[PDB]
Every structure is written in structure tokens, then in C-alpha cells.
Design a protein around this ligand. Structure first.
Ligand SMILES: Nc1ncnc2c1ncn2[C@@H]1O[C@H](COP(=O)(O)OP(=O)(O)NP(=O)(O)O)[C@@H](O)[C@H]1O
Ligand SMILES: [Mg+2]
Length: 216
């Protein structure tokens, strides 16, 4: 018998509206989600790398600076792991949905006016929410040197939860798990995801491993 305390939070109103706009509108090309996942991993890796220049001890929790991308058709998941800075519990509450910058309202306005298309979401400071183009549920496991490992989860609908994480220890970094929508399962096809990772990583300075999971 296991026990966990789970904390439930409400999304900021504009973030809720944005998630609704991302989920309930048709977009012909959703590949930006993968660009944004990889972008966030790279930024997290840069942050810990630069921290290490001024204090080498920050890397002791995990010496490797790398990205792993794991399509799993059986599980209907795409997982992206980085060994970057990671997020504390408070970092996840603040960065993943309780605070909204002015980018949110302006992005929704520009989507509706035609000034911006969905592929431009990262420029408005809300790139993370692009995951909901292709995923019904997003799970973010993260470990920062300053906290225990936590897991954030949301299926949208106005709420997210955060709990102490009892799954595989990361050492340091973030493991984002996208539970893919049925009509978006093609993004788990090995050749398709391999080639898109190539397309969306030309400028990425960290090693990327693609690990395709086959069941039995
Ligand atoms: N892999 C990750 N590692 C650490 N922090 C992350 C990661 N992904 C997202 N975040 C945090 O979530 C925030 C929001 O991400 P995003 O919505 O993509 O905006 P942005 O990248 O800051 N522009 C980031 O600024 C980070 O603080
Ligand atoms: Mg980003």
C-alpha cells in the first residue's frame, strides 16, 4: 500500500483560455509542439551548463548533458528527457500555469486576427502549451538540485496537480510525457519522429538519442 499527497491548482484564466483555444481549434500543422519541447530542453541544458562555469559542483547530480526522445506506440506516449537544470515544486507551480505574462492575451488576439499562426507560439512566451496540440494529458517529472523530484500533471479542464514523484529518479533534469491524442499517433511512427527530430534540431548543441520502444 502506497500513499501520496497530491496538490491541485487552478490555471490562471488566460492560460485556461489559451489551452481551450489550442485544444478546440483545428490546426493543419502541429509539428511546432516538437520544436518547443526540444527548445525547452536545450534552454534547460544551457542554464545548468552556464551555472557550471561559475560553480562546477552543480553537475554532480548528473554529469551528462543530453536529450533523449522516446516514442512508445504501445503506451501511446512521446517522452522527452533532458539533463538540464530541472524545476523545483515552486518552479513548476509558477512556470507551468499559475502565472501569465502579457504574451498570452496578445497571442490569442493574433491567432484570431491572423497576425500569428500556431507555429509562432514560442515567441509569445507560452511555447509549453503547444503540447496540447497533440496530447490529451501532459505529465512533467522534474528534479532540480534544490528540491525533491516532483511530478506535475494536467489534462487541461482548468486544473493541474503536483505531487512528490515516486517513479524513476532522474538525478537532475526533466522528463515530459505526452499522452497522445488518437488522431495524432502518427507522431510516434519511428521514421516520422526520427526525421522530425533531425528537422527540429539542426541548431541544438547537445546530443540527442532517439529510443524507439517496441513491445515484446
Ligand atoms: N525541460 C525544462 N526544464 C526546465 N524548465 C522548463 C522545461 N520546460 C519548461 N520549463 C519552464 O517552463 C517555462 C515556460 O516554458 P515555455 O512556455 O516554453 O516558455 P519559454 O521557453 O520561457 N519562452 C520555461 O521558461 C521554464 O522555466
Ligand atoms: Mg520554451
Amino acid at each position: 500500500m502506497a500513499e501520496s499527497q497530491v496538490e491541485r491548482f487552478t490555471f490562471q484564466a488566460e492560460i485556461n483560455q489559451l489551452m481551450s483555444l489550442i485544444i478546440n481549434t483545428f490546426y493543419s500543422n502541429k509539428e511546432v509542439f516538437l520544436r518547443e519541447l526540444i527548445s525547452n530542453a536545450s534552454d534547460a541544458l544551457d542554464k545548468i551548463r552556464y551555472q557550471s562555469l561559475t560553480d562546477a559542483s552543480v553537475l554532480e547530480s548528473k554529469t551528462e548533458l543530453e536529450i533523449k526522445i522516446i516514442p512508445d506506440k504501445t503506451a501511446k506516449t512521446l517522452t522527452l528527457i533532458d539533463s538540464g537544470i530541472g524545476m523545483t515544486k515552486t518552479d513548476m507551480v509558477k512556470n507551468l500555469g499559475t502565472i501569465a505574462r502579457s504574451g498570452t492575451k496578445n497571442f490569442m488576439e493574433q491567432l484570431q486576427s491572423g497576425a500569428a499562426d500556431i507555429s509562432m507560439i514560442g515567441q509569445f512566451g507560452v511555447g509549453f502549451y503547444s503540447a496540447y496540440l497533440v496530447a490529451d494529458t501532459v505529465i512533467v517529472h522534474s528534479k532540480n538540485n534544490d528540491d525533491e523530484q516532483y511530478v506535475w500533471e494536467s489534462s487541461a479542464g482548468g486544473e493541474f496537480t503536483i505531487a512528490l514523484d515516486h517513479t524513476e529518479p532522474l538525478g537532475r533534469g526533466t522528463k515530459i510525457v505526452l499522452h497522445m491524442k488518437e488522431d495524432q499517433l502518427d507522431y510516434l511512427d519511428e521514421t516520422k519522429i526520427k526525421n522530425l527530430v533531425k528537422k527540429h534540431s539542426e541548431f541544438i548543441q547537445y546530443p540527442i538519442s532517439l529510443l524507439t520502444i517496441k513491445e515484446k
